[PDB]
Amino acid sequence: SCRCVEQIIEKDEGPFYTHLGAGPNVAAIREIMEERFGQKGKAIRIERVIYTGKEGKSSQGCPIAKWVVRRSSSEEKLLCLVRERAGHTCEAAVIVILILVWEGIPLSLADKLYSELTETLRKYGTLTNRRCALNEERTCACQGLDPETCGASFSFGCSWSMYYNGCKFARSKIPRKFKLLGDDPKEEEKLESHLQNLSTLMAPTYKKLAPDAYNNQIEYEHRAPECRLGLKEGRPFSGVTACLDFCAHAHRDLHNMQNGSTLVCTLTREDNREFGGKPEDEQLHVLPLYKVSDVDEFGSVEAQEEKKRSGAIQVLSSFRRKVRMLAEPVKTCGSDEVWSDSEQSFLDPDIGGVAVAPTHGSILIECAKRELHATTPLKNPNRNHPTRISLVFYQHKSMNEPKHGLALWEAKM
DNA sequence: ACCACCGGTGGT
DNA sequence: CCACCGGTGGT
Ligand SMILES: O=C(O)CNC(=O)C(=O)O
Ligand SMILES: [Cl-]
Ligand SMILES: [Fe+3]
Ligand SMILES: [Zn+2]
Ligand SMILES: [Zn+2]
Ligand SMILES: [Zn+2]
């Protein structure tokens, strides 16, 4: 690993990593995933996706899907997207780039988190501004224009800071990982309890399904316990962000730790909680640099055509829709109605845009640090009653010092 | 190079 | 409100 080519050119074959899983061929991946998940056959679904490196986006630079991978039946339990690396014959020729557990957390818990997080964050949440909230031009209105109701991200836990080259709480006597508006310890305590319990629950699923990435993220658990979430032995997570009707424009999460992954737990509005329902709107998670294969897991063309006809792979067509654009770009540190369309993305077969439609209670695992990814904008974003909430669990780089890096920073001053 | 980032504290 | 801390991938 590796002599297939003299140079691994990642802009040609895609980013190379094996910590979600890797093998000589697709069959080897099924064996790995069958072993990990504890079931065989129909319970596991593998889709081959192809890295094209050409980004699907609207004429305004905002996220679009060209294909949607949807849960095929209630019998399908685990979805894995795999990349067969262009021109490789070695033991890591095929790598796993996304794992989706459809039935991730109990539905009663997912129902409750959706209510409680919506209510808490609408009343007390302080929003976190991120780069990926806007397009390149900084002029789109994908989140909505009503500041009371627009899509938003709320970040909790620990985060890396360039100022300390370590945890942002380096100088905080009593850090509040779950800081809400004002100073209401009781509401923060409730929110902490929800997210800590969820961290605790998701850790063993992470270990089960992506053991190498998991084991990477727990290597320094005992050195930096204050920079970890979770209430039981085994604490891979450090930060968590709640995204409510939030359109994440194409991005990578660049200060996530090397060789780790992100877990996304999805909660949906009450009209999208039944298999085979037709919700009024939905949000998709998109890999803009990939296209779907002409062939299914096992190499059949016909089987892939079956899936396209059944809607297990939804082939989308281009749109031409009215959208808002701000008169001034949003800064660092009025609006007009414009035409937005996706026609150019659909004319080129090699422009990417593979989406998955995560369901209520599902858990998605991907290397967000390395893979370009995005979420689609809602028709009418409303964080007071969101179409989708994502809870995104991660660990940043350089979060391996005790007490949020207090001692190390003191040594510096 | 060079932009822009899932920021918090202490003192006016 | 303000000054104070300044690491890097993508391009
Ligand atoms: O919500 C999702 O599915 C994707 N979220 C992100 O990529 C993010 O918050 O960085
Ligand atoms: Cl990641
Ligand atoms: Fe992301
Ligand atoms: Zn946009
Ligand atoms: Zn090779
Ligand atoms: Zn910390």
Pairing of strands A94-101, A166-167: unpaired
* Residue A313 CB burial class (10 angstroms; 0-12, 13-18, ≥19): buried
Pairing of strands A388-394, A239-244: antiparallel
Helix (H/G/I), strand (E/B), else coil: A375: strand
Pick from A393, A329, A335, A390: nearest CA to A358: A390
A387 lines ligand 1 (CB under 6 A): no
Obtained via which technique? X-ray
* Residue A353 CB burial class (10 angstroms; 0-12, 13-18, ≥19): buried
φ and ψ at A409, to 5 degrees?
Answer: -70, -40
DSSP H or E stretch at residue A344: helix A343-347
Q: Which pair of structure tokens corresponds to residue A100?
A: 């989706």
Q: Which amino acid, A392?
A: V
**Reported resolution in A?**
1.8
Give the start-end residues of each E strand in A169-317.
239-244, 262-268, 285-287, 290-292, 313-315
Between CA A308 and CA A315, with CA A311 as vertex, the angle to 5 degrees is 55
β-pair partners for A396 = A256
Question: How distant, in Å, are the alpha carbons of A99, A220, A226, A256 from that of A198?
Answer: 19, 21, 17, 20
Residue recorded with tokens 């920073």 = A409
Which nt has its C1' nearest the CA of A258? C9
A2 is in an annotated binding site: yes
Do the Cβ atoms of A285 and A132 come closer than 8 Å?
no
Residue recorded with tokens 């009215």 = A322
A241 lines ligand 1 (CB under 6 A): yes
Query: Helices then strands (H, E): number in chain A?
Result: 8, 19
User: Which residues make Cβ contacts (< 8 Å) with residue A115, sequence separation at least 6?
Assistant: none
Q: CA A364 to CA A336: how far, in whole Å?
A: 36
Bases of chain C below 7 A from a protein C-beta are 5-10
Which chain residues have CB less than 5 Å from ligand 4, an ion? A 62, 135, 140, 142
How far is Cα of residue A130 from the mean position of the Cα atoms in its chain?
A: 15
Q: CA A166 to CA A26: how far, in whole Å?
A: 39
* Residue A28 CB burial class (10 angstroms; 0-12, 13-18, ≥19): middle
**Closest ligand to A252 CA?**
3
- Which protein residue has the closest C-alpha to ligand 1 atom 10? A253
Distance A91 CA to ligand 5 centre (A): 7
Which chain residues have CB less than 5 Å from ligand 3, an ion? A 253, 368
β-pair partners for A391 = A242, A265
DSSP structure string for A43-76: GEEEEEEEE-----B-TTS-B--SEEE----TT-
A253 lines ligand 1 (CB under 6 A): yes
| Peptide linkage before A227 cis (omega within 30 of 0) | no
